[PDB]
A paper describes a structure:
PaGT3, a uridine diphosphate glycosyltransferase (UGT) from Phytolacca americana, is known for its ability to glycosylate capsaicinoids and other phenolic compounds. PaGT3 adopts a GT-B-fold structure that is highly conserved among UGTs. However, the acceptor-binding pocket in PaGT3 is hydrophobic and large, and is surrounded by longer loops. The larger acceptor-binding pocket in PaGT3 allows the enzyme to bind a range of compounds, while the flexibility of the longer loops possibly plays a role in accommodating the acceptors in the binding pocket according to their shape and size.
Residue numbers in the entry: 7 to 54, 64 to 254, 270 to 319, 331 to 484
């Protein structure tokens, strides 16, 4: 019986798909163990036999609050750099656990480049998992290597991405200031080691499907030389609420869903602009979130608009017939869920690799419309708030704009292809079989 150990970073966006991968492996009669920390254990226990191993996270040692065991909670350069020091200090526990258990494979988070050598100490192959699209993997590497943002003179000047079979235009504002304004050696070295681990390790597991982005599934393997397996969307593996009853009464494709993911850190002025745009648009909506609402808002929109304050059942909402569009930050799990539900998206990237995912959705898949956000940053400065008019424009365009029906038709195709990829005989099913067979024969 093969044993594969999974080691995601403590971020919801990596933890949930890593659990889905562990489940996909477990369904093939592979023993799957997931490493996490105490304050994150519930996330897996609730979601779940896949075994959990708890490591101690040295928060105090790196100057974090004891309760800061997840990446979303480390807001700001100081806290973020401390968090990465902290996770780097898990290496001793990882190596002790590997020596003790001797698994056949380690699937480790992109943020752990050192995991490669930790596994090599015991002749164990290591796979990298990023939780993002082939397109983002390729675009980030081409930007890192060719630095096409050096050839510009203004924040808004458009440059093309080198080498790609599509002409993808981007601007400096869409890149972290740490890369183009005031170089911090720390982030740059971090990114270098991450991208290098893709070639130094045994290979890369990708939560995507070949038919979704074939040019980039190929580019990653050919022009960039990585060994990769596409096994996603991994969430389809394992496959009421008051808002769903609320939706049952409504016209097909008539409601807009708005949600900014797990890393959502949104300020009151921004929410205020969103509220005004939603009211002015006349569109029915489910919005996942006085000081941030127009007075009388929730009563004025009753029956047409719903604000969800807690966790929303995002997949169940997107797959409800009444939901016709998705305003998203273009985190890859949300983007994939929109694709699998066949729901067109208004793209609102914030940080990380979300601006690359936005390019994939709008220019290549052609299933979305941009809201107009073009500034990369962890937190929103009040001077960068996206205004009511842009938001209303996007809300109208995604429902009744030019090519809106075409976007709906294209997304329906991708929905079909996604389900086909994961069923027996599909490309993702097949690549998972291929990967597991390769792991079973490793010497
Ligand atoms: O109210 C809610 C809110 C969310 N969810 C679910 O949480 C998931 C969100 O993952 P997503 O990629 O969109 O957000 P996030 O964790 O911020 O992205 C980081 O992780 C991503 C993956 O690596 C990365 O692409 C991105 O750049 C990072 F910022 C997604 O599966 C939703 O369905 C829900 O069910 N109910
Ligand atoms: O792929 C990526 C990714 O998954 C994550 C991520 C970041 C924060 C989270 O909370 C969860 C995930 O960030 C990234 C940052 C990059 O510069 C490049 C990437 O490719 C990713
Ligand atoms: K090359």
């Amino acid at each position: 019986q093969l044993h594969v150990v999974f080691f995601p970073i403590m971020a919801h966006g990596h933890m949930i798909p890593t659990l889905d991968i562990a489940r996909l492996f477990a369904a093939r009669n592979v023993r799957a163990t997931i490493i996490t920390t105490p304050l994150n254990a519930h996330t897996f226990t609730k979601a779940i036999t896949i075994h959990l191993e708890l490591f101690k996270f040295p928060a105090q040692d790196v100057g974090l609050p004891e309760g800061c065991e997840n990446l979303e909670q480390a807001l700001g350069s100081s806290l973020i750099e401390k968090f990465f020091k902290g996770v780097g200090l898990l290496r001793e526990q990882l190596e002790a656990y590997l020596e003790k258990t001797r698994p056949n494979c380690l699937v480790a988070d992109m943020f752990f480049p050192w995991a490669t050598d930790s596994a090599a100490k015991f002749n164990i192959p290591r796979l990298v998992f990023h939780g993002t699209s082939f397109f983002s993997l390729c675009a980030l590497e081409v930007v890192r290597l060719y630095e096409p943002h050096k050839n510009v003179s203004s924040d808004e000047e458009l440059f093309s991405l080198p080498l790609f079979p599509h002409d993808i235009k981007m601007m400096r504002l869409q890149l972290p200031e740490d890369v183009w304004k005031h170089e911090k050696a720390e982030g740059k070295t971090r990114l270098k080691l991450i991208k290098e681990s893709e070639l130094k390790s045994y290979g890369v597991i990708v939560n995507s499907f070949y038919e979704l982005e074939p040019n980039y599934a190929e580019f990653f393997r050919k022009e960039l030389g990585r060994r990769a397996w596409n096994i996603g969307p991994v969430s389809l593996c394992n496959r009421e609420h008051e808002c769903l009853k609320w939706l049952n009464s409504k016209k097909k494709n008539s409601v807009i869903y708005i949600c900014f993911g797990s890393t959502a850190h949104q300020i009151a002025p921004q929410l205020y602009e969103i509220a005004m745009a939603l009211e002015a648009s006349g569109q029915e909506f489910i919005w996942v979130v006085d000081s941030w609402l127009p007075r009388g808002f929730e009563q004025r929109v009753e029956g047409k608009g719903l604000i969800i304050r807690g966790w929303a059942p995002q997949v169940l909402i997107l797959e409800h017939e009444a939901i016709g569009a998705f305003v998203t930050h273009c985190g890859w799990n949300s983007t994939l869920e929109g694709i699998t539900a066949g729901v067109p998206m208004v793209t609102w990237p914030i940080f990380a690799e979300q601006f690359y995912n936005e390019k994939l959705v709008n220019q290549i898949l052609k299933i979305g419309v941009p809201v107009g956000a073009n500034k990369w940053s962890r937190e929103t400065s009040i001077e960068d708030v996206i205004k009511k008019d842009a938001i209303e424009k996007a809300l109208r365009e995604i429902m009744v704009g030019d090519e809106a029906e075409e976007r709906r038709s294209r997304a329906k195709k991708l929905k079909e292809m996604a389900w086909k990829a994961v069923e027996e005989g599909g490309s993702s099913y097949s690549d998972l079989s291929a990967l597991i067979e390769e792991l079973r024969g490793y010497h």
